[PDB]
Amino acid sequence: LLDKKWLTFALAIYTVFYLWVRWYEGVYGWSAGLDSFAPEFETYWMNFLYTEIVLEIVTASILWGYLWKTRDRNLAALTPREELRRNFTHLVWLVAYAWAIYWGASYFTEQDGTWHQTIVRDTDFTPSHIIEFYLSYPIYIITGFAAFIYAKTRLPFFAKGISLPYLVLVVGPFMILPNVGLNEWGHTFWFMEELFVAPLHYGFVIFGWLALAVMGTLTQTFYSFAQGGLGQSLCE
Amino acid sequence: LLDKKWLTFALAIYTVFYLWVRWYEGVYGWSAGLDSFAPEFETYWMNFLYTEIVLEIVTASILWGYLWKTRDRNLAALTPREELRRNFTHLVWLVAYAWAIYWGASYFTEQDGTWHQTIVRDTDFTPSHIIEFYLSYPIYIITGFAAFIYAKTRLPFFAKGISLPYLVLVVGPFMILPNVGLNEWGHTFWFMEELFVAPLHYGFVIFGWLALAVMGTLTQTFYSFAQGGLGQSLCE
Amino acid sequence: HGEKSQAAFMRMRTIHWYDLSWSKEKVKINETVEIKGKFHVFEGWPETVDEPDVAFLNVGMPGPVFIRKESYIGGQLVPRSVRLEIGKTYDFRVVLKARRPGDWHVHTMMNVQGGGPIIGPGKWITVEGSMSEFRNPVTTLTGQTVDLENYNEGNTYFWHAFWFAIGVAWIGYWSRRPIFIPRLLMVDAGRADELVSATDRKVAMGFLAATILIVVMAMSSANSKYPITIPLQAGTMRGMKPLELPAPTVSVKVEDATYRVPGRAMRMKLTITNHGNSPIRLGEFYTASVRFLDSDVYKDTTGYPEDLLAEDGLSVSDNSPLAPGETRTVDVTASDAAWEVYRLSDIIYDPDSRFAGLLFFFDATGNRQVVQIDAPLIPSFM
Amino acid sequence: SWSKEKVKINETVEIKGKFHVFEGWPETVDEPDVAFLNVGMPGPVFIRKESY
Amino acid sequence: ITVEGSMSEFRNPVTTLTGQTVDLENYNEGNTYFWHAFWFAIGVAWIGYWS
Amino acid sequence: AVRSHAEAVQVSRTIDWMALFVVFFVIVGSYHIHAMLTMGDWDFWSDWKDRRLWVTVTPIVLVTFPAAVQSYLWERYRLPWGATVCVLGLLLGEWINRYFNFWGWTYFPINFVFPASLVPGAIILDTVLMLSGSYLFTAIVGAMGWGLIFYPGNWPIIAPLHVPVEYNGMLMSIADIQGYNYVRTGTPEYIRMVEKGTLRTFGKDVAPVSAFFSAFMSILIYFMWHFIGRWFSNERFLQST
Amino acid sequence: VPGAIILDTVLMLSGSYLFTAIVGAMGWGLIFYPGNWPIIAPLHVPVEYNGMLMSIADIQGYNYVRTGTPEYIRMVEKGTLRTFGKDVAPVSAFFSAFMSILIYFMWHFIGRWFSNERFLQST
Ligand SMILES: CCCCCCCCCCCC(=O)OC[C@H](COP(=O)(O)OCC[N+](C)(C)C)OC(=O)CCCCCCCCCCC
Ligand SMILES: CCCCCCCCCCCC(=O)OC[C@H](COP(=O)(O)OCC[N+](C)(C)C)OC(=O)CCCCCCCCCCC
Ligand SMILES: CCCCCCCCCCCC(=O)OC[C@H](COP(=O)(O)OCC[N+](C)(C)C)OC(=O)CCCCCCCCCCC
Ligand SMILES: CCCCCCCCCCCC(=O)OC[C@H](COP(=O)(O)OCC[N+](C)(C)C)OC(=O)CCCCCCCCCCC
Ligand SMILES: CCCCCCCCCCCC(=O)OC[C@H](COP(=O)(O)OCC[N+](C)(C)C)OC(=O)CCCCCCCCCCC
Ligand SMILES: CCCCCCCCCCCC(=O)OC[C@H](COP(=O)(O)OCC[N+](C)(C)C)OC(=O)CCCCCCCCCCC
Ligand SMILES: CCCCCCCCCCCC(=O)OC[C@H](COP(=O)(O)OCC[N+](C)(C)C)OC(=O)CCCCCCCCCCC
Ligand SMILES: CCCCCCCCCCCC(=O)OC[C@H](COP(=O)(O)OCC[N+](C)(C)C)OC(=O)CCCCCCCCCCC
Ligand SMILES: CCCCCCCCCC(=O)OC[C@H](COP(=O)(O)OCC[N+](C)(C)C)OC(=O)CCCCCCCCC
Numbered sequence A, B: 001l002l003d004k005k006w007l008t009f010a011l012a013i014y015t016v017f018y019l020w021v022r023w024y025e026g027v028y029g030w031s032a033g034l035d036s037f038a039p040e041f042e043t044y045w046m047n048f049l050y051t052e053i054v055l056e057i058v059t060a061s062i063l064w065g066y067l068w069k070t071r072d073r074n075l076a077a078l079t080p081r082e083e084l085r086r087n088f089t090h091l092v093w094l095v096a097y098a099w100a101i102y103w104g105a106s107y108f109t110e111q112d113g114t115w116h117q118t119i120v121r122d123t124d125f126t127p128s129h130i131i132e133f134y135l136s137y138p139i140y141i142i143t144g145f146a147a148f149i150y151a152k153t154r155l156p157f158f159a160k161g162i163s164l165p166y167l168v169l170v171v172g173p174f175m176i177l178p179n180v181g182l183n184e185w186g187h188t189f190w191f192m193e194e195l196f197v198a199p200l201h202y203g204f205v206i207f208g209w210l211a212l213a214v215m216g217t218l219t220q221t222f223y224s225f226a227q228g229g230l231g232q233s234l235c236e
Numbered sequence C: 001h002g003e004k005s006q007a008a009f010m011r012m013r014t015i016h017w018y019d020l021s022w023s024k025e026k027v028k029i030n031e032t033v034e035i036k037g038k039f040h041v042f043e044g045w046p047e048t049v050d051e052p053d054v055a056f057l058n059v060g061m062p063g064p065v066f067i068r069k070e071s072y073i074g075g076q077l078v079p080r081s082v083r084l085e086i087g088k089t090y091d092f093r094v095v096l097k098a099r100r101p102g103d104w105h106v107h108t109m110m111n112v113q114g115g116g117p118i119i120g121p122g123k124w125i126t127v128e129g130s131m132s133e134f135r136n137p138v139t140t141l142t143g144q145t146v147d148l149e150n151y152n153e154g155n156t157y158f159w160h161a162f163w164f165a166i167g168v169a170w171i172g173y174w175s176r177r178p179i180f181i182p183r184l185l186m187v188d189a190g191r192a193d194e195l196v197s198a199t200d201r202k203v204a205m206g207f208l209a210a211t212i213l214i215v216v217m218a219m220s221s222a223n224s225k226y227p228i229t230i231p232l233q234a235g236t237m238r239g240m241k242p243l244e245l246p247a248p249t250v251s252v253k254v255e256d257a258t259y260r261v262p263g264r265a266m267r268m269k270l271t272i273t274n275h276g277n278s279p280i281r282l283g284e285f286y287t288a289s290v291r292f293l294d295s296d297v298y299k300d301t302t303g304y305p306e307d308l309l310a311e312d313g314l315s316v317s318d319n320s321p322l323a324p325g326e327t328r329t330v331d332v333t334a335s336d337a338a339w340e341v342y343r344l345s346d347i348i349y350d351p352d353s354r355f356a357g358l359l360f361f362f363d364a365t366g367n368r369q370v371v372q373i374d375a376p377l378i379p380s381f382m
Numbered sequence D: 001s002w003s004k005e006k007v008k009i010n011e012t013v014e015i016k017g018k019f020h021v022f023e024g025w026p027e028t029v030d031e032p033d034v035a036f037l038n039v040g041m042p043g044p045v046f047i048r049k050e051s052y
Numbered sequence E: 001i002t003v004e005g006s007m008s009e010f011r012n013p014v015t016t017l018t019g020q021t022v023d024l025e026n027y028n029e030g031n032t033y034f035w036h037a038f039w040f041a042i043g044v045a046w047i048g049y050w051s
Numbered sequence F: 001a002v003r004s005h006a007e008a009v010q011v012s013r014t015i016d017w018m019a020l021f022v023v024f025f026v027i028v029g030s031y032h033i034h035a036m037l038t039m040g041d042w043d044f045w046s047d048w049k050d051r052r053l054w055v056t057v058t059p060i061v062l063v064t065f066p067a068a069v070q071s072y073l074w075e076r077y078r079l080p081w082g083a084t085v086c087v088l089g090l091l092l093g094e095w096i097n098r099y100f101n102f103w104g105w106t107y108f109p110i111n112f113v114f115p116a117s118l119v120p121g122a123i124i125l126d127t128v129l130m131l132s133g134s135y136l137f138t139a140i141v142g143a144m145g146w147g148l149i150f151y152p153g154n155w156p157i158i159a160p161l162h163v164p165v166e167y168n169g170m171l172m173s174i175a176d177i178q179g180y181n182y183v184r185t186g187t188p189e190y191i192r193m194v195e196k197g198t199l200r201t202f203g204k205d206v207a208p209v210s211a212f213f214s215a216f217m218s219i220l221i222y223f224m225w226h227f228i229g230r231w232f233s234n235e236r237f238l239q240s241t
Numbered sequence G: 001v002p003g004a005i006i007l008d009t010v011l012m013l014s015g016s017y018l019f020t021a022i023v024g025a026m027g028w029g030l031i032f033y034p035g036n037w038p039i040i041a042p043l044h045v046p047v048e049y050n051g052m053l054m055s056i057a058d059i060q061g062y063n064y065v066r067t068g069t070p071e072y073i074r075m076v077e078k079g080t081l082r083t084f085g086k087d088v089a090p091v092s093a094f095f096s097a098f099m100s101i102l103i104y105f106m107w108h109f110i111g112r113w114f115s116n117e118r119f120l121q122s123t
């Protein structure tokens, strides 16, 4: 069996959900979403913010708790074939993390750019901010934490210790979410110019760099893949 | 034989050429060299720039290629006396590098200072810039590269690896030449004040520091000198 | 010699120099030449140039071929930086004393703290004699007359040579013994503790004590001699008195302005309204150190530089006298080789294609009016 | 002018006058774009009730 | 302010000093697309060659 | 190898002279670049040699190379003249350029374009290192002295230039008149970073306060550049570039 | 893509990372503007727009209103008194190439660190 169709679901769920989110923000961007003090803004974007925050907290708790509770206690008695299957599942988790990272840190971030350069931002919770800071960022954070936990709890290579590159890749992009405090603070106060390259935005930049730890993470996963079932063929 | 009269030539060629260059710039500094759009400026300084750039490229290519092609293949079967002679020749190369570094980074650099503090600079290719950035800097770069290549190709101590202090001493002062882009950019744009201590000039400063690697380079050459013919006498 | 490279629009709209005069064209060593004139700070000061809050009246010249004896803005000496107001006209006077023989292109320039050099018209001034005859005497408040050419030179040389000799003595004292390789081997192979031993420490203590004592004694001696000293006098000078010019009786509205690419001419259409009570005629157009003259109306007699002077470079479609109260629109063409020699045609390369200048209107009796014009300058290619 | 030279506790003393900002303001001092009318005194031996 | 019609009917003509009239809605769009696609194709070809 | 003890001694002496040349002139080039681009403007002009900025900046930026060269030479050879050789090389390069370019090419007088004196500070730094070989003690005490002795060391040279002169209705020092008369087309007066007075300048404290600030910052810069020179001495063989 | 291709080929040939940082980064900085010139050149055709000279890109920015992006935010070339002749683009390109050398040198080691396969035992 090895690599199964969980990868198709991993791609499709993010693609479909974010396409629907884009449709929603295209429909309610203007017209209930321009005026932050209008009653329709509360029903179409503040309610969205509340619901998405509650659902993200619940989903993160449930997913992480399930992954930690179903952790493999007897990692020693794991066959190489099962280890290969678990390595493929972890690679599917990493693919989902990469897809979520794309959707969060490229699509909706530059969408925040094109929203703020063309409207006068009315609050810290513009529809763009609700979608990007509080939906896509938590979603990719949840996916990254889940992938890290799966590696630690199913892969003997990633067990017996916390991998530094994986921890950086998982936590650095997470630090972008608390960095929103710098975004709002240096915008209301420091810098009223919409300048997307303003130093108030270098918090995203610095912690966006930590995603480069995916390189060490991926060579670690390559070594984990090539533990018992490394071949032969490769180097033979 | 050991140390031969190549050292006298090494000193004299730089001394004579740069004395003639100083005479040339004293004669044509004013009077074909003040107005960068005058026809005489093209015949006396733009032609100088073109000729010197072509000659520097040709000389660098020929010298480096000859030094690399005549590299000693059988370094193992090198007698201590021949090694001592080659060490003295490398020391002559280092003396030539030091002389060229002086002429480039002290004489013509502060000459650029006294030129710009007293005329209104008319272009990125003032006679001072032509002499300093595009003659003396390439000359000392060529000399440093030649000395490094000679060490690597004739001295067994400097073979079997790239010496970090020598590489720094050779490449850092070279980085001053591309740093001219910062000099011109931060002068036309950033900083219209002639301030010689302006941060637009800290590119020269930072890469001028890398010449301090001559200390590690020279202790390496001392060890290379004291390999087989270290004495005795010294420490005896 | 530093202009013709600056941006054409920046040379056009910073500072307009006019009524320039030179006392002499050829001087001897130690002889004085005086440069006078007026400069007007343009209202449309470019945002890339800092406002002339801190400005210095300088001289454009190849090193001290002249010495600046005096410089005035208004009627008061300005040895320091000064504050200028945008839109104001000031009169200036620079006194130069010849120092170096030769033919020198002397410019009057204004350096602005955050914008760089604003170079005015330059004039060739011939200096004859010998540099050895130059003297720069000055009398101090302590009652002594010194020549600034060589005053304190001997003392400076003496002290620098003395300290250099002290350092060289230290280095040579340590350099009498073998220097690099045996000392390196001694330090590496085992503890060294042998290459620095008495009386080396005694010599170093003597060097340190002598250095401190000599510095203290020299400072005390230089305080007993020259007991009266003052710090360097610096600081921007405010309250420059601008000229109180009468309000112009001529109003000019620029209706489009074009220049051919390539070409040596600039064309503009002006609506001139004559107020007051005298028939006026357009006599001059000054744009950036270049004076386009209508020779039938006005002739230059102040010895303006020839390469900057267009004697008949200003052609007006209808330059008949303009009766008071009458308004007419004419096509004005300013054409001269200077427009390309001084790269005023290179405004096509500039990121701000706007020009500014001064129009000089003359009546029959000869009294003149200065009006300022500024408009976008549109290139024409076909 | 000073309203009183000797006061009791809780008593009010008023200081009046004029000040002229010199035209030749030194360049080392920033222009008085932001200025505060203060009282030079060794701590709150008086309290500033009003300032105009 | 109410706007009625279709966005497809919008035109933004402008005449240059070189004597040509262009519509700012789509002027240079084809050239931009072509050059970006060409360079992207070059990079993709490099990557696929190594892949 | 070498023939005998005598020939080894002669070879060592020749190496000594050649390596001294190499050290001296590489230091001249690098140190002069650093100095002229970190303190050059004050060093160029007597009317820039003020009590605040000149006294503050010059020792701070000039202690850099002496610290590194000391950390190498003393540590590896027990040669206590790294600071002296750095300062002598800087002075030689500066004087050569002043005489042949400032006064030679252009015709600015030497009494206008003379450099500052640094040998007293260099001697203090070297002797304080050799005695009490502690690099920390050097960085604290010798750098203090290097910063503090700068202005008193240069006072005999610049004191005659500070005689007051009544010049056309305005009070000017002789250095001020030099800067006024000898036109620097590229160097207007406002570029001059000199003492201009403040409302928080209490009494006659401008020179000593600047000297003490320069001494403290010199301690800091010496501490940094000792380790910078320690790194620059590395004899590592970076296998590939 | 041209700069990326230069950087990659200069690395593969002459595998020296130092040689890449010096030469390939130089080329990456220098080829940026010439690489984009075919795209933006048509937008720089001069236009006489309501009495003022404007490029086509200028008219685009003027017409297509960016409510959050006023014109003054634009950090573009505005001319200086020390801008000599026709040097704005080449000078900027060479400055960018030098700074690209520096940034490439820094980020080579940054990426070296980010590749670490260490197992930080506890967080
Ligand atoms: C990592 C964990 C992430 C957790 C957060 C998830 C956020 C979900 C959206 C919040 C909505 C909100 O809050 O708003 C509630 C909205 C407000 O719209 P309405 O006014 O009712 O109009 C009618 C509804 N339309 C406008 C959508 C037609 O209505 C709803 O009930 C509909 C929400 C549907 C969400 C599920 C579909 C997603 C795409 C399919 C692939 C997954
Ligand atoms: C991973 C992190 C999850 C955290 C979830 C949030 C828990 C909130 C607890 C109640 C706080 C409260 O009610 O008080 C917060 C007060 C509200 O102030 P107010 O509305 O101005 O006035 C007072 C009104 N009262 C009296 C009714 C409260 O201060 C603030 O403005 C802060 C509000 C910003 C919260 C940002 C959370 C973003 C989470 C993103 C998850 C993906
Ligand atoms: C590391 C490799 C370095 C390569 C660069 C070398 C640059 C050489 C100079 C460029 C000249 C130029 O370009 O100009 C060409 C000049 C222009 O002068 P002219 O108008 O002909 O007047 C007549 C010539 N006078 C004014 C010199 C009298 O004339 C020439 O033919 C003469 C150039 C002579 C150069 C060789 C002598 C150097 C001193 C002797 C010790 C070596
Ligand atoms: C070690 C490095 C050696 C490199 C040697 C130089 C190779 C030049 C190749 C041709 C480029 C060209 O012709 O084009 C460069 C264009 C010229 O632009 P333009 O004159 O304004 O107008 C266009 C005019 N055309 C159409 C006739 C070209 O851009 C520039 O302004 C950059 C010019 C600065 C080059 C600085 C080189 C310094 C080398 C120093 C060596 C010691
Ligand atoms: C051997 C031990 C005994 C000697 C102890 C010396 C004590 C101070 C002498 C002051 C001389 C004087 O006269 O005051 C100070 C003189 C100016 O004097 P003024 O113009 O009269 O100032 C008018 C005001 N007064 C009357 C109150 C003095 O300069 C100075 O502002 C020097 C300021 C230095 C500040 C930084 C010091 C850092 C110290 C670091 C230590 C590791
Ligand atoms: C290891 C410590 C070695 C110290 C060596 C000191 C030698 C003597 C200097 C006399 C200075 C003078 O005469 O007074 C102060 C004057 C400045 O005076 P000014 O008011 O600016 O006027 C200038 C015009 N004059 C000279 C006609 C008045 O010079 C200085 O700026 C030196 C400041 C540093 C003094 C360091 C000593 C204090 C203790 C240091 C240890 C914590
Ligand atoms: C293959 C070897 C031979 C070729 C050598 C090329 C020499 C230079 C060519 C200049 C072209 C030209 O025309 O001048 C320069 C052209 C503009 O020209 P302009 O508008 O006429 O300038 C008017 C003034 N003038 C007449 C005196 C030229 O752009 C530039 O300002 C380019 C400035 C680049 C500055 C940074 C360079 C950093 C180099 C780093 C090296 C490692
Ligand atoms: C490894 C080195 C590879 C170099 C590849 C160069 C390809 C040819 C570029 C022609 C540029 C041109 O045509 O001239 C210069 C023009 C700018 O001109 P502008 O005056 O601002 O006007 C703009 C409007 N135009 C285009 C109608 C005139 O473009 C540039 O900004 C490029 C600057 C970098 C030139 C690099 C070559 C110099 C030597 C480099 C090695 C030290
Ligand atoms: C607690 C801090 C107070 C200051 C002390 C810091 C000095 C520490 C330096 C150090 O680590 O020791 C190095 C040398 C060791 O030499 P010794 O062989 O101990 O010589 C002792 C005899 N002597 C007093 C003449 C020195 O000893 C010396 O460095 C010299 C010791 C004499 C003090 C004065 C020297 C400095 C002159 C300016």
Ligand SMILES: CCCCCCCCCC(=O)OC[C@H](COP(=O)(O)OCC[N+](C)(C)C)OC(=O)CCCCCCCCC
Residues within 6 Å of the ligand: B167, B168, B171, B172, F236, F237, F238, F239, F240, F241, G017, G018
């Ligand atoms: C302006 C800042 C000052 C520059 C000083 C930085 C020097 C950094 C040290 C360094 O370069 O490391 C070299 C390694 C490559 O290692 P190797 O080539 O495997 O050498 C083996 C031994 N060694 C690992 C200890 C080097 O890393 C590499 O990938 C090779 C790059 C070497 C470039 C160093 C040259 C610096 C010249 C400016």
Ligand SMILES: CCCCCCCCCC(=O)OC[C@H](COP(=O)(O)OCC[N+](C)(C)C)OC(=O)CCCCCCCCC
Residues within 6 Å of the ligand: B064, B145, F241, G010, G013, G014, G015, G016, G019
């Ligand atoms: C002193 C500085 C002058 C520039 C030299 C810096 C290059 C040093 C790079 C290096 O360390 O060596 C790596 C390779 C080794 O390959 P080799 O097996 O030596 O190949 C030799 C045959 N060859 C000439 C076709 C290359 O050799 C190469 O890197 C390629 C050598 C050919 C030079 C041109 C390559 C660069 C193209 C832009």
Ligand SMILES: CCCCCCCCCC(=O)OC[C@H](COP(=O)(O)OCC[N+](C)(C)C)OC(=O)CCCCCCCCC
Residues within 6 Å of the ligand: A167, A168, A171, A172, G118, G119, G120, G121, G122, G123
């Ligand atoms: C924005 C800057 C980029 C972040 C990169 C900094 C990483 C610093 C390295 C580090 O975290 O050291 C871990 C040690 C704890 O050590 P241990 O848990 O004992 O691990 C044993 C092996 N080890 C000592 C080599 C780690 O020190 C500790 O106390 C544990 C702290 C680990 C936190 C690292 C996670 C960084 C995520 C942002």
Ligand SMILES: CCCCCC(=O)OC[C@H](COP(=O)(O)OCC[N+](C)(C)C)OC(=O)CCCCC
Residues within 6 Å of the ligand: A019, A022, A023, A024, A026, A027
């Ligand atoms: C790899 C990221 C793909 C992002 C595509 C996207 O944002 O799609 C939304 C956009 C919306 O434009 P349109 O297709 O015209 O439909 C408009 C519907 N709303 C306004 C809700 C977005 O176009 C599509 O829906 C095309 C489907 C692409 C599937 C990968």
Ligand SMILES: CCCCCC(=O)OC[C@H](COP(=O)(O)OCC[N+](C)(C)C)OC(=O)CCCCC
Residues within 6 Å of the ligand: A190, A191, A192, A193, A199
């Ligand atoms: C890594 C480079 C950081 C450079 C910081 C920068 O560009 O700041 C520009 C800003 C200048 O403000 P400005 O661009 O004029 O802002 C105009 C808009 N307002 C006045 C509303 C802020 O300076 C500061 O306020 C200090 C920044 C500290 C950085 C750690």
Ligand SMILES: CCCCCC(=O)OC[C@H](COP(=O)(O)OCC[N+](C)(C)C)OC(=O)CCCCC
Residues within 6 Å of the ligand: B019, B022, B023, B024, B026, B027, F096, F100, F104
């Ligand atoms: C260690 C660096 C020596 C630099 C000396 C220098 O720049 O010399 C030029 C200068 C030029 O002044 P001068 O001798 O009067 O001859 C003028 C000739 N021009 C104007 C061409 C320089 O003086 C000399 O030629 C003296 C020879 C010294 C030999 C080491």
Ligand SMILES: CCCCCC(=O)OC[C@H](COP(=O)(O)OCC[N+](C)(C)C)OC(=O)CCCCC
Residues within 6 Å of the ligand: B190, B191, B192, B193, B199, C050, C113, C114, C115
């Ligand atoms: C290591 C110390 C670097 C300190 C930088 C500095 O002194 O900059 C002064 C300058 C202030 O400009 P100013 O001196 O007023 O320049 C006057 C002349 N103009 C207006 C033409 C630039 O500030 C900047 O523009 C930011 C520098 C960033 C350094 C990484």
Ligand SMILES: CCCCCCCCCC
Residues within 6 Å of the ligand: F224, F227, F228, F230, F231
């Ligand atoms: C700021 C000073 C840092 C100097 C670096 C020295 C590193 C030494 C490692 C062997």
Ligand SMILES: CCCCCCCCCC
Residues within 6 Å of the ligand: G106, G109, G110, G112, G113
């Ligand atoms: C500024 C670049 C510094 C990168 C840090 C790399 C550290 C590697 C240690 C193994």
Ligand SMILES: [Cu+2]
Residues within 6 Å of the ligand: C001, C002, C105, C106, C107, C122
């Ligand atoms: Cu001139």
Ligand SMILES: [Cu+2]
Residues within 6 Å of the ligand: C015, C016, C040, C041, C042, C043, C372
């Ligand atoms: Cu004017």
Ligand SMILES: [Cu+2]
Residues within 6 Å of the ligand: D020, D021, D022, D023
């Ligand atoms: Cu007053």
